[PDB]
Amino acid sequence: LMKAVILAAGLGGGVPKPLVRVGGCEIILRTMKLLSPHVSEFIIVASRYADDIDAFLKDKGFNYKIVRHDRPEKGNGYSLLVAKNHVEDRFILTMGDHVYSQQFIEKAVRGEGVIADREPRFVDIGEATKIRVEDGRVAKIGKDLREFDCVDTGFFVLDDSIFEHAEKLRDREEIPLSEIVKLARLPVTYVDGELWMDVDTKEDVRRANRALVSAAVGDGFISRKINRKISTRISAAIVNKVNPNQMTLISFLVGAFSALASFFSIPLAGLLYQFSSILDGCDGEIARASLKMSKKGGYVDSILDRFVDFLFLAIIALLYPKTATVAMFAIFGSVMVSYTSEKYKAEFGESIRVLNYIPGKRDERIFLIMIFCLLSAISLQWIFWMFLFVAAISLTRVVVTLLAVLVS
Amino acid sequence: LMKAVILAAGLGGGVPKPLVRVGGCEIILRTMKLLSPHVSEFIIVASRYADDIDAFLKDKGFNYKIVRHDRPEKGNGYSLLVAKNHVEDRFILTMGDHVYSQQFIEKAVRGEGVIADREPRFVDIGEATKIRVEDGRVAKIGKDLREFDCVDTGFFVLDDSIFEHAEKLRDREEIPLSEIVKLARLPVTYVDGELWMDVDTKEDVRRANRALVSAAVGDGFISRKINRKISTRISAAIVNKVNPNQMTLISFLVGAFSALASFFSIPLAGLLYQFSSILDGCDGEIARASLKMSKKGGYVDSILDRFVDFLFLAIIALLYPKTATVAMFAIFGSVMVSYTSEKYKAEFGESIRVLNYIPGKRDERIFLIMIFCLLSAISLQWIFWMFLFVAAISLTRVVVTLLAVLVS
Ligand SMILES: [Mg+2]
Ligand SMILES: [Mg+2]
The DSSP annotation for B243-286 comes to: -HHHHHHHHHHHHHHHHHGGGS-HHHHHHHHHHHHHHTTHHHHH
Q: Within this chain, do residues B227 and B307 fall inside the same structural domain, yes or no? A: yes
Tell me which of A328, A344, A352 to substitute to probe the interface with B (most B C-beta atoms closer than 10 Å). Answer: A328
Q: How many contacts (CB atoms, under 8 Å) link A and B?
A: 103
Distance B342 CA to ligand 2 centre (A): 15
Residues of chain A in contact with residue B310, where contact means CB-CB under 8 angstroms, are 332
Give helix B381-406 / helix A295-319 axis angle, nearest 10°. 150
* CB neighbour list of residue A253: distance below 8 Å, 6 or more residues apart: none
All residues of chain A having their beta carbon less than 8 Å from the beta carbon of residue B406 are 296, 300
Identify whether the C-beta of residue A138 lies closer than 8 Å to the C-beta of residue A179.
no
The CATH number assigned to the domain holding A348 equals 1.20.120.1760
Question: Identity (one letter) of the amino acid at A91?
Answer: F
Same domain flag for B233 and B164: no
Residues B391, B393, B399, B405: is their CA dihedral positive or negative?
Answer: negative
The answer to whether B401 and B345 are in contact (CB under 8 A) is no
Distance B287 CA to ligand 2 centre (A): 11
Are A118 and A171 in a shared domain?
A: yes
Q: Out of B324, B338, B402, name the one closest to residue A339 (CB).
A: B338
Query: How deeply is A236 buried, as exposed, middle or buried, from its count of CB atoms within 10 A (0-12, 13-18, 19+)?
Result: buried
> How close A269 gets to chain B, by Cα (Å)?
20
Instruction: Say if residue B106 carries a ligand binding annotation.
Output: yes
Q: Which ligand is nearest to the CA of B297?
A: 2
Q: CB distance A339–B340 less than 8 Å?
A: no
Same domain flag for B223 and B213: no
Task: Please tell me what resolution, in angstroms, this structure has.
Answer: 2.7
Of B217, B232, B255, which residue sits at a domain end? Answer: B217
Integer angstrom CA distances of residue B305 from A180, B309, B358:
70, 6, 21
Q: What is the distance between the alpha carbons of residues A5 and A94, in angstroms, rounded to a whole number?
A: 6
- Nearest chain B Cα distance for residue A70, angstroms: 43
Whether B405 and A339 lie within 8 Å, measured CB to CB: no
Task: Name which of B299, B332, B405 is nearest A344 (Cβ-Cβ).
Answer: B299
For residue A295, the chain B residues in CB contact (below 8 A) are: 347-348
Chain B residues within 8 A of A407 when measuring between CB atoms: none
Nearby residues of B355 by Cβ (< 8 Å), 6 or more positions away: none
Asked if B274 and B147 sit in the same domain, the reply is no
Phi, psi of B240 (to 5 degrees): -100, 5
Domain range for A96 is 1-217
A402 annotated binding-site participant: no
Question: Do A130 and A222 share a domain, yes or no?
Answer: no
CATH assignment of the domain containing A108? 3.90.550.10
Rounded to the nearest 10 degrees, the angle between the axes of helix B50-57 and helix B27-35 is: 50
Q: Which ligand is nearest to the CA of A278?
A: 1
Q: Residues B195, B196, B197, CA angle at the centre, nearest 5°? A: 135
- The CA-based diameter of chain A, rounded to the nearest angstrom, is 90
A70-81 CB burial, b ≥16 within 10 A, e <16: eebebbbbbbbb
Q: How many distinct structural domains can be found in chain A?
A: 2
Nearest CA in chain A to B298: A347
DSSP string covering B316-384, please?
HHHH-GGGHHHHHHHHHHHHHHHHHHHHHHHHHSS-------S---HHHHHHHHHHHHHHHHH-THHHH
Q: Which of A217, A238, A268 is the last residue of a domain?
A: A217
How far is the centre of ligand 1, averaged over its atoms, from the C-alpha of A302 (Å)? Answer: 7
CA-wise closest residue to B177 among B85, B86, B91, B72:
B72
CB B306 within 8 A of CB B363: no
Please list, in sequence order, all residues whose beta carbon lies within 8 angstroms of the beta carbon of residue B408, skipping any fewer than 6 positions away.
Answer: A296
Pick the closest to residue A128 from A110, A108, A151, A95 (CA basis).
Answer: A151
Looking at the structure, do residues A213 and A135 belong to the same domain, yes or no? Answer: yes
Ligand-binding annotation for B117, yes or no, is no
Asked if residue B279 and residue B385 are part of one domain, the reply reads: yes
Helix axes A362-378, A324-348, angle to 10 degrees: 170
How far apart, in whole angstroms, are the C-alpha atoms of residue B97 and residue A257?
68
- The torsion region of residue B349 among left (phi > 0), alpha (psi -120 to 50) and beta comes to left
Nearest to B402 among A303, A321, A346 (CB): A303
| A9 annotated ligand-binding residue | yes
Burial A327-353 (b: 16+ CB within 10 A, else e): bbbbbbbbbbbbbbbbbbbbbbeeeee
Domain boundary pick from A188, A217, A246: A217
**CB-CB: which of B327, B336, B347 is closest to A328?**
B327
User: Do A277 and A227 contact (CB within 8 A), yes or no?
Assistant: yes
Are the beta carbons of A98 and A35 closer than 8 angstroms?
no
**A168 and A238 share one domain:** no
User: What one-character DSSP code corresponds to residue A226?
Assistant: I
Q: Is A17 annotated as a binding residue?
A: yes
Q: Which residues pair with A142 in a beta bridge?
A: A130
Partner residue opposite A343 with nearest CB, options B302, B325, B406: B302
Instruction: Looking at the structure, tell me whether residues A94 and A208 fall in a common domain.
Output: yes
User: Shortest CA distance to B334 belongs to which of B308, B355, B358?
Assistant: B308
Tell me which amino acid residue A268 is.
L
Assess whether A23 and A155 both reside in one domain. yes
Does residue A315 sit in the same domain as residue A362?
yes
Which residues of B are less than 8 Å from A319 in CB distance? none
Nearest-5° Cα angle at A52, A48 to A53 = 95
